[PDB]
Ligand binder design. Structure first.
Ligand SMILES: *[C@@H]1O[C@H](CO)[C@@H](O)[C@H](O)[C@H]1NC(C)=O
Ligand SMILES: *[C@@H]1O[C@H](CO)[C@@H](O)[C@H](O)[C@H]1NC(C)=O
Ligand SMILES: *[C@@H]1O[C@H](CO)[C@@H](O)[C@H](O)[C@H]1NC(C)=O
Ligand SMILES: *[C@@H]1O[C@H](CO)[C@@H](O)[C@H](O)[C@H]1NC(C)=O
Ligand SMILES: *[C@@H]1O[C@H](CO)[C@@H](O)[C@H](O)[C@H]1NC(C)=O
Ligand SMILES: *[C@@H]1O[C@H](CO)[C@@H](O)[C@H](O)[C@H]1NC(C)=O
Lengths: 98, 49
């Protein structure tokens, strides 16, 4: 993951300072594309806004960015409501978000 | 996640971006948005809730 890259001069050349983000501590979680409450085609279903839906082997689903795990309770802000496009995961309970 | 398509046919269908497997458009494969560019008026109401 690329952050910033400066360049400096050098003898007979040029040398780049590529700053990056190698990750080191993985944590294994569960990840859906999105959550449904109803089995019916045409149900109210949701997907994450600029992130991935995540559960750390936990009873309910959460929000986390695409490349790093800072889990958050999913709200209206970080959730896009769309469709039954792929097979999203039915969690068999109604929403906690207006 | 696809393109709207008609094989010189009376009504429009859904197909992926790079391959032609036409499907009747449903609620699943259709996003409702706006009158942004000049989309095509088909002069009939929808068949999808
Ligand atoms: C989640 O469950 C998997 C099952 O294989 C386990 O290996 C892993 O340690 C668990 N991770 C967390 C964060 O609970
Ligand atoms: C997230 O929601 C759970 C209940 O669903 C609550 O117990 C917890 O305090 C909330 N906040 C976190 C994990 O920061
Ligand atoms: C609850 O979830 C199970 C599997 O996750 C599946 O049978 C269906 O989505 C739901 N079942 C019922 C009876 O609502
Ligand atoms: C569609 O119409 C065009 C008109 O030029 C024709 O050339 C083409 O063969 C037709 N294709 C199909 C699949 O009907
Ligand atoms: C798609 O809809 C048409 C009518 O609009 C129907 O005749 C046809 O059987 C449907 N299914 C297909 C093409 O698989
Ligand atoms: C029906 O479509 C035609 C051309 O596609 C255009 O005049 C307009 O979009 C519609 N006309 C009427 C009278 O609704």
């Amino acid at each position: 993951l690329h952050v910033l890259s400066l360049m400096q001069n050098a003898p007979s050349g040029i040398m780049f300072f590529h700053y990056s983000l190698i990750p080191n501590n993985t944590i294994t979680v569960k990840t859906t594309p999105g959550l449904c409450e109803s089995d019916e085609l045409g149900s109210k279903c949701i997907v994450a806004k600029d992130g991935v839906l995540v559960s750390a082997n936990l009873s309910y689903w959460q929000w986390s960015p695409r490349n790093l795990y800072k889990p958050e309770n999913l709200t209206f802000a970080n959730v896009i409501a769309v469709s039954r496009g792929a097979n999203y995961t039915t969690l068999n309970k109604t929403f906690d978000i207006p």
